[PDB]
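User: I'm putting together a teaching handout on how multi-component assemblies are represented. Below are the sequence lines for each component of a complex, exactly as they appear in our records. Could you produce the 3D structure of the whole assembly as structure tokens, so the students can see both representations side by side? Please keep the chain order the same as the input.
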Amino acid sequence: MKLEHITKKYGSNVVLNDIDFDFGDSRIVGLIGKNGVGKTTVMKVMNGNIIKFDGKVDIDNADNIGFLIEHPKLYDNKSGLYNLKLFAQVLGKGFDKAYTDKIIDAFGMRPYIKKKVKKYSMGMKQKLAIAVSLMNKPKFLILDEPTNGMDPDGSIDVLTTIKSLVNELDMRILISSHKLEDIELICDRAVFLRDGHFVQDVNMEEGVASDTTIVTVDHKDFDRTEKYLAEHFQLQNVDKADGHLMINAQKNYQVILKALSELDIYPKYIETRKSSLRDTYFNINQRGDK
Amino acid sequence: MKLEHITKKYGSNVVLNDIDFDFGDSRIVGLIGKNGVGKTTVMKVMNGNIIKFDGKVDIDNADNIGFLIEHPKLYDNKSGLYNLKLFAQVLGKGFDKAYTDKIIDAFGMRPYIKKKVKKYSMGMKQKLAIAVSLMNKPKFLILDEPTNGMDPDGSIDVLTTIKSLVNELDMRILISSHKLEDIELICDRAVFLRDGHFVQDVNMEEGVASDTTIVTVDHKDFDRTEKYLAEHFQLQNVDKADGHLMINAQKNYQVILKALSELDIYPKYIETRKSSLRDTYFNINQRGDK
Amino acid sequence: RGSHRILNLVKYDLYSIFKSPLTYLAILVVSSLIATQSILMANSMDNPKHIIVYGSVFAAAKWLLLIIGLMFVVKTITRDFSQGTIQLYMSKVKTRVGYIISKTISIILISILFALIHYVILIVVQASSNGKNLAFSKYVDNLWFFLIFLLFFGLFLFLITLASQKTAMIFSLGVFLVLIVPFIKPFITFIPRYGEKVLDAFDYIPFAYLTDKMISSNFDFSNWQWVISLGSIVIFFILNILYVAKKDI
Amino acid sequence: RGSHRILNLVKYDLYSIFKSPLTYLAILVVSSLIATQSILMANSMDNPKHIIVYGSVFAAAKWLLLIIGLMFVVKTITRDFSQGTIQLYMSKVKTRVGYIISKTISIILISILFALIHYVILIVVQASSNGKNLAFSKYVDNLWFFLIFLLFFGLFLFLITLASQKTAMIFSLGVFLVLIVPFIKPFITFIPRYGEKVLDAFDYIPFAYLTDKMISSNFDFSNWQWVISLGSIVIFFILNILYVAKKDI
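Assistant: Of course. Below is the structure of the complete assembly, with chains in the same order as your input.
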């Protein structure tokens, strides 16, 4: 499943403009953009709903695709179990009791799986939508705002369960969603949509050079600290007038402070300036609205 | 509008437990809670859709209330401008041309103000419903998640417009919504709801913002380090779950690192950042899940 | 003020009626059916000098226009409950009472409009054909009958739509309630030895005698029937005001 | 495989059909209406020895059951577009074509079951009353006619639902297409100097002759009608497959 040089047009308005995508050694990808830029259109192209792609898409037939396109699609007058059984039989290979039971048990829908979907709440429908989508046993899962009616704690719980299923079954997810602070907790890479194209693509494990960590130390220790950092990692900017040293972004601060605390050194201050999804998204997108 | 000793119950299930409320020297107030905890019930409690509370709810008849509850409320068949005019007559005092023009111009709905609601998307229809709420010229304005499926830029500009109208008219707003970072963007004071009560009340007036340092450590050592820092460096507020300890503003970490080294306990992660409602929210509401 | 808010709401509900194309489609279909029925009813099984008597057309137009007007009333009344926007109109107590009064005022004004449409259609029928014109007092008292019918049934269906807040049940229940009594009476009333007693006693149950009397081409009321019908309308209005101010949504 | 997927879909929509209260409400209404119509039409208009002629009951039961099965078909085929869960099925080309084959098998099965319903109800009516029963070959040919009628109209409305993605409009068009042509035809065809010519040419437009012979109590066909109907059903099936594989949401 790869997309190369994809352009889709509606009359005279250009939605997609020469986009390529490939799942290369990554499990969770995030899609971020504004409203009406063609996020649902790119997901539909990646899904199969739209047919006039005007390019080439290579997808194996044995692989199943599961998706959610923003509002839940369920049977309102009928119950959740009816929906689960039907989309497992209709879209997937079949129904298995152990596998379905594990799915039900992991999500936490035991008290209300036999209640009518009409009586559900918004977060209940969102979870039911994710579960019905997952019932296909897909190889690629594509969710459009799966967390558009649930609380932040609920968001952490749903994403952690989703990651756990990423590990229990080798599966790859493509996610388009707002609330980038919720996407950054568990994600491997992010793609940014602007002016109909994905302007920047960021892989979070390797990081980018714009992410920075600023460490300030004493004047007597400045030489020794600079020597150690020059020995161990790459140094980009050093400012003697400022007293500030710039190092690469690190998720864990443990080993660095261990080394300095073992050598009896205490920095006066530490903080980080980083090009996170909020900074890159806002700097790129403040250019066309304000 | 003030509430005093409100206790509403549905049979055996209790939703509210002896709450009191009042807009005390605050202009924008946020209501935060989980999903299905009684957030929509509280919105109904404050606004007036429920009468059997066995108490006293104090509102004056000369002040109108324009509101937003979960789903946007509009006439889907008719047009947006028709909805605006109709709800201006049914709820407000009359038709003001300049005032109405200002509302459309500030929100940005003019290109599509004459188009049918069925051709709208979710954020635009919700924003128009918010404009309908301001059409009433209320003294109290209540919104249930106004920014659910709208991009960050859209949320910041709509809230900014709301503030410019909070200065154009002497108005007081309560917003119950997720996206607590959007709440710190536009809110003056926040209240936290758990088990029908407002557990904590944080007031922010100046841009001091109470910068804080985060220390993470395992439980068997967290007790001793928490105790030790309470006997030594004066504490304001405490967050147990996220591990936030608030000493006064300290420029230099040397005395902290030296004391923590002599304590033989060590942090996994240390950072300084502006405080937010997310840490407090997690402290209040991790109690039911675990 | 409150007076302007009630009158403006009735005015805007009428404006909402006059713009939709279904109102003029209903008028076109009803006029075509009444004209075909009138031609079939008088110009073919006897072969007169194309004289038409108007009692049968009166009865047919009454039944068709009442059932159509009832459906128009149920749809307009339950519009807000279908879209859920009703939860926006139940803010204060004074608003909830002005809401109920305004809905009743909308019912009286809608009833007047349907009575006027029924009068004009029958006049156009009279203009097309030849015969003996009717009298104004029949139409005025007919207007009273439209008013009584629509207010009573609208308040009953209003109570049901407040209690259940579901619309498909209201439409099916309204259709069933209007159309079951003429359908059900021949297959069951003629059987009992208690049938004559139950039939005279059906003259005091408001559903039974009002529904029975839509088909008849002339209405005749006693003092007890007029008092009980007006009292039932008043009791439903009082009950609606009390329940809207004591029900929790 | 795909075969199990299609058969599983036909079994599950029919299962969803069998688990609703409206299916039996519909059976009770059709049986009550047909029994009253048959009793009124044969047991009192000449006071016989309670003999009943089955052509009128056949035509009335066939007519009522067709308009009820038609509404059941429009609802079944428009359910997914109404709730928008059809978006979940239009994913790959193989599922989109298996979808069309499965809907065709579902339409075939609903038509066969409703024909069986017609058979059981008419058989009970014949058992109760007195006369000469009809031959089985008439019922088999009648079964074929149910199949043809339902297949044609379901595919036509499927094309319409693909173009519009609105459900109220389809419901209106279904009622409009069934009930307007028999209603308009007597009041206008005898008028022109082209009516006999248009009437004979009315036997080749599929909508027109299928609805005209719909209210007849016996059907008869020519070779040209059979070829045109079969070609039209096949062309709609091919057109549906091509449009479903070429449309974008």
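A couple of points students might notice: Chain B has one domain: 1-290. Chain B touches chain C through 22 residues (CB under 8 Å).
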